Every structure is written in C-alpha cells, then in structure tokens.
Symmetry: D4
Subunit: 158 residues, 8 copies
C-alpha cells in the first residue's frame, strides 16, 4: 500500500507547525495523519496509538513535534520499528537551547533531526523515494523548481 | 512509616553519581533503592518498576538520573503520585547545555531540579523533614556541621 | 495544622509572577502567604520574617522569587529547616543566563529549582502529598485533568 | 540490488569517525563505501564521485561527515536524488557551536542530522527497513538487544 | 584597470544587506555587480558566474552574503584566485550562532569575515588601496570624515 | 593605613585569594584574609564585617565566591564603602558563573574584576585618589609593565 | 570637589550616559559628559584625558562604549586613578559584547558595573572612603532603598 | 617595491601564533616583520612603530594578534591607511567568547577577521595577488597542492 506519514505532536499548541509539514507532504502526494499525544502526560495514549499505526502493512514514517524539552521524539523512536524524524517547533527561549533535547540522544535512539518543517516533509519524501519512483519524480520536480526560482531571481538582476 | 528514596538512573554508567546520592542519604538515615531503567529504550520496564514502588505504603521520593537529553525525569514525574527530584549527571558537552532538557518542562510536570548529588539527598531529607522529626533532627545536625566547618576554617587561618 | 507555603519575592516588581504561583496553590487548597524582602538590602527584615514563619508548628514550604542574580533562594534555604523551592521570574537577558545563579549552589544549600510558576505550585503540593491524602487527591484530579485535555484534543483534531 | 551507504568525509582526519559508522553498518549487513572529498577545495572531484554513485540502480543513502563549518552535507544533499544523513565529527571548539552549520539548512536542503555515529548507521538501516524485511529483522534484534542489556544491568542491582 | 567588486548573495531575501554594501562602494567610486546564487541548490550556476568574472582582466574582490549556515563564502573562496570577503546578513536566531559557519573555515579557505556591510565595503576599498591611489585618497577622506563627526559631536554637547 | 579585607566563601578559594594578597603587598597595602559563606554562615560574616566597619581607616573589601556568587552582593549591601568582586575562575557551563557576579539589582554596586592582580591594582588605584604614596606605587608598577613590553619588542624585533 | 568624567564612544550612548549623570547629581557629585572613540579619534581622547589628568582634585572616569569595548581599557591604561566601565545594554549575540569589557589583561583594571545607577553609586562609594559628605549621601540613598522594600512588604503583605 | 606584512602582537606570549603566520608567509615568498606592542599599555610605542611602517612606499598589510579582549586590531586599523587582518590567538575561555571582541567593530573600523594563522597568511597573499602575478602563481600552486592531497587521500583510502 501507499506510504504513510504520521505527524505526532505533544500539544495542540504545535498544530501550526504540524500543518506546515502536512501541507508540504500533500504537495508530494504523500498521505499523512495528524495526532496529538504527550510522552510524559499521556504515555499510554501514545503507546496505544503507535501500536495501531505499527500494525499497518505499509511503509511508514513518524514525524514527532514537541516543544520545550523534547522527550516525544525519543519515546516514539524507541517504540516503532522504522525510521522517525524529529521536527521541533521553533523557540527562542534560552537562545534556542531547547534544540539540545532533540540532538542529544543515547546510542540506540536515532530520530532524524530537521529544523524546517518543509525540510521534514522533503526528507520524508526522499526517504520513500529510495523505493517509490512516483515520489522520486515528485522530489525531482520540487527540487528543480527551487533551483530554477533562484536562477530566475538572479536573471531579474543580471 | 519510614521514608524511601528510589534512585533511578538511565544507565549503569551513571552509577558513580547515584552512589554519591545514596551515600549521603545513608548519613541522614534514609533508606534508598538504586535501580536502572531508560525512558526511551525500556519504558515498560520502568513503568513496571514504578508500579511496584508506588504500591508501598510509605512516604517516598524518586531521584531521577539521566545524562544527555533527560527524558527520564519527566517520564517518572508524569507517572508517580508524589514529588520527584531530577539530578542529572555532570556533563561539559556543549558547555553543559544538556541541563536545558531537565529545566524545560511543560506545565504539569514538576520535578525538582538540583545539580549536586549531595544536595539532591539534602533536598530529599528536607522534604521528609516537614513531617519526620527524626530526619529534621538529622538535617539540623548536618547543616549546623557544615556551617561550623567554614567558621573553623576561618579561625584556622595564618 | 494544615500546610502553609510562604511565597517570598525580592521585589514588588515580581508580584505578577508570585500571583501565578498563589493562584495555582489556591486550586490545590493550600494556604499561602505572599511577602517581599531582599537578601542584600533588607537581610534583617528577611531574617525577622523567616523567624516568625519558622516558629509555626505546621508543614511549610518557602517558594523564593528573585530576578537577576538570585541570592534570595540560597539565603532563605540556608536559614530555614525544611525544604524550599526557587522559582525565578523569566528573563531573556543574556539568553536567559540568570538561571545559572539559581542552579549553582554550594554543597549544603538545596533549593528545588522549577521554572514555571504553575509547576512550583504543583511541586509544593506533591511534597505535602507524601503525607497529606487530601492534597494527594487534589494532585491526582489535577494531573488527570491535564492528561484528559490532551486526549480530548486528539479526539477532536485528529486527521 | 542490495542497499548501499556511501560514507563521504571531507578529510582523512575524519576517518576514525567514519569507521565507527562503517563498523556499525556491517553489523546490519549493509554494504558501504568510504570516500574522501571536500566541498570547497575539491568540488569537482566530489561531483564526479556523486555522479558515479547516483548512476547505480540500487537504493542508496549518503552519510556526510565534515568538521568545522559543515558545507559538505548540504552540497551533497542538494545534488543527489534520495535522502542523506549528516553525521559531523564531535568538537568542543566554541563549546560545540560547529553543530549549527549542520542544523541551519535553507528550505529545500534536507539532510537528516544525527550526532552519534552508531545512530547514523541505525537511522540508515531503519530507512531501508521500510522496504527491506531482512534489514528490518536486523534492526529488531539490535534494538531488542540494547533494551535487554539495560534490564540485565538493573537485574544485577535489583 | 579599475577595480570590481562582485556582491554575490545566496538569496533575493539578502538584497537589503547587499544594497548597503553597494551604496557604500559607490561612495568610494568602486564599480560593483550584484548577483544571486545559492551554493547548495544552484552550484553550477554559481560556478558559471564565477568563471565569467574570473576572466575579466581587472582587479577584483568577491563579497559573499549567505544567511543561516553559510556555505557560499567558502565555496566561492575555494574557486576564485584572489581574495574574498564574507559578510553574512544579521541574524538573532540561536543568539547569532550562524556566525560560526562563517568563522570556522578549514586550512586553505581564507575569506575575510566582516560583520557590518559598510565595513565590508571599507575593507574592500582598503584592499584595492594598496595599489590604487585614487581609492586610497577616497578612503582617507572617508575615515577622516568619520573621525571629525565624532569630535564635532563632542563639541556640540551642552 | 588603608586596609583591604579579602573575604572568600570557601577555603578552596585560598590560592585565588593569595594571588590578590601577594599583589597588594607589592603595593605596600595591608590586607586581611578571611573565610565566610553568605548562605551557610551569614551571622559569622556580619559579625566579621562589623568588626571591620568600625575601624577608622580607609578600607575596601575584595570578595571571592565561586559558583553562584551571593557573597559579593551581601557584603556590598552591608558595608558603607566600595567593594570589589573577584570570583575564582571556572569552566563550568562555559564560565556562566560570571553572570551571578554581573547581574546586580540597582543599589548593589560591587566593582567586578576577573584577574586577581587586577583586583589588587583597582584597590590600589581607588586609594590612590587620596593617597600619594600608593599613587606613586601604582605609577611605578604600571610603568614597569609598559617598559617590559617595549623591551620585549626591542629583543624579539624581527 | 570630586569630579566624574563620563566618556562615551558615540553620541548614540547619550541616554545611557545621562542615566549615570542624573544619579551622580543626586549624590551631589559634579560630572562632565564627553564623546570620543578609542579607534577613530584616539588623539582627541588623549588630549581630553590630559586636560582632566592635570586637575588637582579627586577624579574618576566612567567609560561607555558599545560593541567591542576598547574605550575602557584605553582610558584605564592612560589615567592614573581608578576607572569604571559601564557599557550600554545590547542583545546582540545574547549580550556577548560584555566579554570585551570583562577580559582585560593583567595591568588594566577598570571596574565593571552593568547598571548605570550602580556606576554612579560605585563612584560615590569610592569617594566616600575619604569624603564624609558623599558618605552621608550614600548612607541616606542606600537606607531609602531598603525602607522602600520594607514598606512594599507592609503594604502588599498577604 | 615588494609587499610587506607587519605581524604585530600585543604580547610576547603570542609569539608561537605569530610564528605560524610568518612561516606560512615565507612559503608564499612574502617579506614579514614581527613586532610586539600593546594598545592600552604602550600606545605611543605602537603609534611610533606604525608611523615608521606607514611611511614605506610599498604595498603592506598588518596582521594583528591580541588575546583576551582584542583592542589592538581596531587601534591599528583606525590608524593605518590600508587594510588589516585580525588573527587572534585561540582561547577556550568562556567557550571562545573572546572572539566577539574581534568581530564587533564600529562602522568605519574594518579589520578582516580570520581564525587560523595559515589562513591569515593565505588571505594576505591573496590580497596582494589582485595586483601581483608572482604571488598569484604561488597562491595557485598552494591551493592546487591542498586539493591534490585530498584527492590523493581518497585514491589511497577509498573502500
């Protein structure tokens, strides 16, 4: 079956950030789910949700979004079989130092960290593209279009 | 009933830090248990253990020790009923920025952060001391002793 | 007698922060007092106040609020018998580096550091709850409510 | 054909770090190549190398390793079709601030950042595992073994 | 032959910063070109452009402007023969830590880092001034003028 | 006739204090060296300051406290005259203990100086405003420092 | 009879300087306010300091320079008596300009104070060692500060 | 006459750092002078020295080396006509935060900041190379050699 991306955020306050990821997945033609669950406060709810998705026989990725000290990405990553992507929401608290909670994983916990929500979506697409030629075609068009916009911007100048 | 402190560390590599906490609790006459469990890799093992301690009919505190990005303190704090203390092991990586993973809790997750292991033990004692006169007496002796050492150091000069 | 939390701040400029803590303590049914006193400029005043609260035969906690370089939390913690909680006001000066003045205590000075005012109240409640069943019931209702709101948000907004 | 991981480092001084990644890929039964090329000094050499690998009709990932200001990961990522992983070598220069050069990509450049070399290898395996059942089996054993070591460590204690 | 400064920016979003540099070069009577090209997304476009400028038989400098992780300055510096100047746009993200991506060059890549755009222009002028007396005269007038403004500000007091 | 009271929080600070004391002695300025902690032995410190505050002579206090420095503010809030904070060096959290000495509220005004020889020099130059002997001593000291640099140039001139 | 010379690097620093001057006036201490840059108008600064250094009266210099503060060290290396550095506030690079005022070599000893009211108070308390009038003024000031806190408690006592 | 690079350091303690720069300039065939002088303690000495070098009719650069808070690079840059290069010694104090004293110049003070001593030499060479073909040839040989070593390492060590 088709690829699936599960976008899991710790709080409804993260929804703006999540929708940016979702919007971009939609341009790659990649199905997504958007869910809310907190690692520390609703662990059992999160586990029961992950079991449901894990049971689907289709290629899947999880993109985990948690502000402040991000425990969610590692929690999900240590539970599910396949790859996951951490895409924390932006914060300038302590000059951005919440980022270290996403970076500093133990050996054996391996979420892919990406800062920009459009890049989390692009990484997800490029992961599927190793085996999905339709998604590979979409990635090519997207990345070529990004390069062409820059060159055109220069042409408007010289 | 007599107090219990459960010292839970994410890794056997944290044992030196744990033992400093434990040694200090012993000077206050406070029973402890030392346990190992990782929030991301062995979550079910941690829950199982917490349920066992939570069922004991005695006043209890948990002191949680986890290096790198500390997910363990919030995990435990979100599960148990009573208060908990976060006492992460020291690290100089990224100028100590692992500390932000212990600091930056969501609303509703409230571990007490203390840096020095002797102070984690002292805080625990002083928490019990609100209701346990035996421990209050021990705390008084301990803090008076600390102060007298300094005053003595001054008189010893020249 | 019932628990008491003394909320002591270094400056009246911190009153809003103190009120957030007191507001949350009220939800747990915990009596509080709000006081002002500075460790360096009004030490004797702070000592006099602490002696009065310390003489009360009831379980107590102090929550200490001081901006910039926080000397109040250690001063109070070194004086009183029981536990204390540091909950400094937030600051973005020097990328938040005032926090290190609350973190870096000498051995023998052990205030509990908590950043969020609601969490300072919750920690206080959970400290009393080791021996106080009624406060433990309140904590449980509070923490269950927080969880249920998250699950309800997922039930509504999930796609 | 079988998956391939191309480990590309900017300098021979990075070889120790690269070999940790390679060693771990070998435990997952994943073929790898180890190569050296600098983005700024040997761009054409890097491009000619990437064209050679890109022409292989097999699932591939690139893991890019560059110290100091990491320009290599983004350079590779903007050239190749599929996903890439940035795994910079550790440094304590400016308290680790070289990490921001790997983090702060423009929209449209999406390398997966992972700090630990064993985790770069595990992420690579888990990426292939979405479609490769043999690698999925290896990941399961690996991650289960990591969890079991922790539980056993606790058992030696309580 | 008369000097040329090529102002190359990674994005059209950098134009305000570029124009401050350009405006200041105009006060020194130094010809400039403003161009757009991204190191990671449009590398071939950048190389093509550099070859065109490199073929001009006149003394030239490149001022490279790129936000976030600055790969552009080292890319250009590794390609062209003569000196280059890095003048990244200002950013307050992560307490300005994007600056380390411009600072931390490998041995063999030597762009001049200057923060203020007016100073990037002044450095360029002063570089040419070692051999161009017309520009030396302009630089002298400019720096003398700056000093006289301050002394005047002092006398204007009260 | 002036007196400098060097007060340190811990006997661990002695090496730092003695660097200050030695330098003060080359200025021919009498000093006292004392130990006392602001949080643990507050009464001992006050009793001590009262003894010094009663002396009819010019005096300065140089206060030395590691970690979070509460001692300088405490002393400064109590004594009439100026004080100097000279904290011991630390690499903990990339030296962030320094902010506890910097960030004083309005009304608490210790002079912050990092180098112990400079704490002594500031003390001297403070007295030198009214003490012709100390001023002569400062002039000789500062001239010696300059002549050494110049003779280094004359010797290692290349 | 004492004099405080407030020297700022740029007219942009005036608001900061006037906060210092206003406070000095409540202490009844005469001040001068001057503008001069260490790098651009070094001769203008020296000529100015020579005028002040010749005056037979107690004097302090409070030096104000934004960005990388070279002014305080320059002034301190030239004048006989003590000086005070009071840099203007900045959020650039999370306030890292402060290190240019902190990190003096042995032999250069300006007193660093962050708050302008505290720069004035330090100045006063420096004179107060030999000036009974200023000392009385300091005592009244510092007592007023304390009484206000206490009456705030009495008023907002809950 | 031929180019000259004046390497001026604030303290003899920096001599090793200066030597790394001079060593690299020698490989490019560029004459250098090594001098010592401090901006705050020996200003007049520094000015006197700069006046002597400034009077020479030859292309020159100054490379300025000062630890801790770097006031030397701006002082020299504000005095001399032509370009200068700041190359401070490395420090790990405060996580390397001395670097901000070399970065944060006022408008009108424009030293080129470069961290590595070999790169300060290369930048100097590349500045002269805009007008000096012989130095341009040397730069090209240098930069080609660096590239070829990397490619050779790949050819040996590739698996």
């Amino acid at each position: 079956m088709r690829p699936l991306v599960i976008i899991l955020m710790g709080s409804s306050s993260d929804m703006g950030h999540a929708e940016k990821i979702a919007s971009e997945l939609k341009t790659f033609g990649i199905e997504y789910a958007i869910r809310i669950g907190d690692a520390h406060k609703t662990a059992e709810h999160v586990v029961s949700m992950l079991k449901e998705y894990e049971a689907l026989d289709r290629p899947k990725l999880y993109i985990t979004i948690a502000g402040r000290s991000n425990a969610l990405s590692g929690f999900v990553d240590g539970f599910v079989k396949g790859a996951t992507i951490a895409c924390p929401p932006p914060s300038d608290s302590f000059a951005g130092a919440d980022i270290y909670s996403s970076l500093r994983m133990p050996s054996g916990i391996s979420p892919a960290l990406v800062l920009e929500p459009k890049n989390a979506a692009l990484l997800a697409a490029r992961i599927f593209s190793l085996y999905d030629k339709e998604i590979a075609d979409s990635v090519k068009s997207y990345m070529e279009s990004n390069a062409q916009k820059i060159i055109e911007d220069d042409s408007k100048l010289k």
